């Protein structure tokens, strides 16, 4: 299970989603969004082994292509499979409008 | 265009698919497959900027979350979006059978 539930417990390095709170202005400096200040963007870091929930067939082949060659950084790339929206509030000229960005959050990583 | 056409030309580091020929036995040591010896598995390496064909919304946000914080390796993860099959030939007990693995190749990366 490579989601924000099994990665938000012990320590992990392979394809494990890690906390990635992003303060709209602190990290992205986004100026088109006023609120919220940030959110739990979460994300994924580190590659994955072979039986680590392989999505595509090239995910199991390369998974070994690296795990077999010591010194190769061509491993796979854990990524945010399922995402989540984001209730914000920005300004258009002079009228404030609250929306819900789509896929602006993570809820489970993977290995594409 | 982050495919094996624009990456197989000049040099790139961000989300650019690079050559990844894999010799079934040399790299994966796969013993369940006899032929071919290997194939053009290709793959992707390096993260991506913001306007680098973002797939999910978290691809444009994090793209800046890293491009903004100098010293953060939480960037995105370029991956093989479109893949390709693979005509092989293995053995089942004593009967040889040729098949076509699915998604056992890359034909274009992206940024999940």
Swiss-Prot record, chains A, B:
**What intrachain disulfides are recorded?**
7-16, 15-78, 44-109, 48-111
- Explain the purpose of this protein: Multifunctional protein that regulates the growth and differentiation of various cell types and is involved in various processes, such as normal development, immune function, microglia function and responses to neurodegeneration. Activation into mature form follows different steps: following cleavage of the proprotein in the Golgi apparatus, Latency-associated peptide (LAP) and Transforming growth factor beta-1 (TGF-beta-1) chains remain non-covalently linked rendering TGF-beta-1 inactive during storage in extracellular matrix.
Residue intervals passing through the bilayer: none
Please state the gene responsible for encoding this protein: TGFB1
Q: What is this protein called?
A: Transforming growth factor beta-1
Subunit record text: Homodimer; disulfide-linked. Interacts with TGF-beta receptors (TGFBR1 and TGFBR2), leading to signal transduction.
What part of the entire protein does this chain span? Answer: 279 to 390 of 390
The listed locations are: Secreted
